[PDB]
From a paper:
The EphA4 tyrosine kinase cell surface receptor regulates an array of physiological processes and is the only currently known class A Eph receptor that binds both A and B class ephrins with high affinity. Eph receptors are type 1 membrane proteins with an N-terminal extracellular region consisting of a ligand binding domain (LBD), a cysteine rich region, and two fibronectin type III domains. We have solved the crystal structure of the EphA4 ligand binding domain alone and in complex with (1) ephrinB2 and (2) ephrinA2. Structural analyses, drawing on previously reported Eph receptor structures, show that EphA4 in isolation and in complex with ephrinA2 resembles other class A Eph receptors but on binding ephrinB2 assumes structural hallmarks of the class B Eph receptors. This interactive plasticity reveals EphA4 as a structural chameleon, able to adopt both A and B class Eph receptor conformations, and thus provides a molecular basis for EphA-type cross-class reactivity.
The flexibility inherent in these regions is consistent with their relatively high average crystallographic main chain B factor values in comparison with the rest of the protein (for our high resolution structures an average of 62 Å2 in BC, DE, GH, and JK loops versus 31 Å2 over the entire molecule). Given that the DE and JK loops map to regions in EphA2 and EphB2 crystal structures (Himanen et al., 2001), which move upon binding to their respective ephrin ligands, their flexibility may be of direct functional relevance. While ephrins generally exhibit a low degree of structural variance between different bound forms, structural analysis of EphA4 reveals distinct structural differences between unbound EphA4 and its ephrinA2 (1.7 Å rmsd over 166 equivalent Cα atoms)- and ephrinB2 (2.3 Å rmsd over 168 equivalent Cα atoms)-bound states. Most notable are the structural changes that occur to the DEEphA4 and JKEphA4 loops; regions which we identify above as having a high degree of flexibility in unbound EphA4. The structural differences between the two available apo LBD structures of EphA4 and the divergence in conformational changes that occur upon ephrinB2 and ephrinA2 binding are consistent with the EphA4 receptor maintaining a high degree of structural plasticity in its DEEphA4 and JKEphA4 ephrin binding loops. Other EphA receptor structures, including the apo and ephrinA2-bound EphA4 structures, on the other hand, are more distantly related to B class Eph receptors. However, inspection of the EphA2 unbound structures deposited by the Structural Genomics Consortium (Toronto) indicates that for these crystal structures the primary EphA2 ligand binding loops (JK and DE loops) are partially disordered or are in conformational states quite different to their bound forms.
Numbering used by the authors: 27 to 61, 63 to 158, 161 to 209
Write the structure that this text describes.
């Protein structure tokens, strides 16, 4: 049979995510927000008043198993620069998604120049209204392939937006068609 095989689902992760922010403080930060009223983990950054933002957040190593095409589903909120005072010239309404293939599942320092851009990510047609506040929760999906090393790291680069990442899910598609 067919379907999506999940390699990483950030919302299901039990314990620490193990993700690495660069800079360590003042850029991407883990923030728990209280939806029901159950606490849910997000990674947030909002330096929309500041120039020269280059805030990186990378996952830990993700195995590709036997798959060569991988899909990255991101659920996120993103504020309208128009709705924020005093951000003229510095606020952005996109962020960037990157990847880096590696046989090594415990990379320490990874250079910016090892990462390859998948796409610019923006709020678009797919969203739900949910959640205190009502959050506009966007869903964007990109894919990459063919991957050929044991696994890979994903990274999210913020260049001056007001963004909360609520979910990152990485998966591939099976194609075991039925015989008849």
């Amino acid at each position: 049979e067919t379907g999506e095989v999940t390699l990483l689902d950030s919302r299901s992760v039990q314990g620490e995510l193990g993700w690495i922010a660069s800079p360590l403080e003042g850029g991407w930060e883990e923030v728990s927000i209280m939806d029901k009223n159950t606490p849910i983990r997000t990674y947030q950054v909002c330096n929309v008043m500041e120039p020269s933002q280059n805030n990186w957040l990378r996952t830990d190593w993700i195995t590709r198993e036997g798959a060569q095409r991988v899909y990255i589903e991101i659920k996120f909120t993103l504020r309208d620069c128009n709705s924020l005072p005093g951000v003229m010239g510095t606020c952005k309404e996109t962020f960037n998604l990157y990847y880096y293939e590696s046989d090594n599942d415990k990379e320490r320092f990874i250079r910016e120049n090892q990462f390859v851009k998948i796409d610019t990510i923006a709020a678009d047609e797919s969203f739900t209204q949910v959640d205190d506040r009502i959050m506009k929760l966007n869903t964007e999906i990109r894919d990459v392939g063919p991957l050929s090393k044991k696994g890979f790291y994903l990274a999210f680069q913020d260049v001056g937006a007001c963004i909360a990442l609520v979910s990152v899910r990485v998966f591939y598609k099976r194609t075991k068609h039925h015989h008849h």
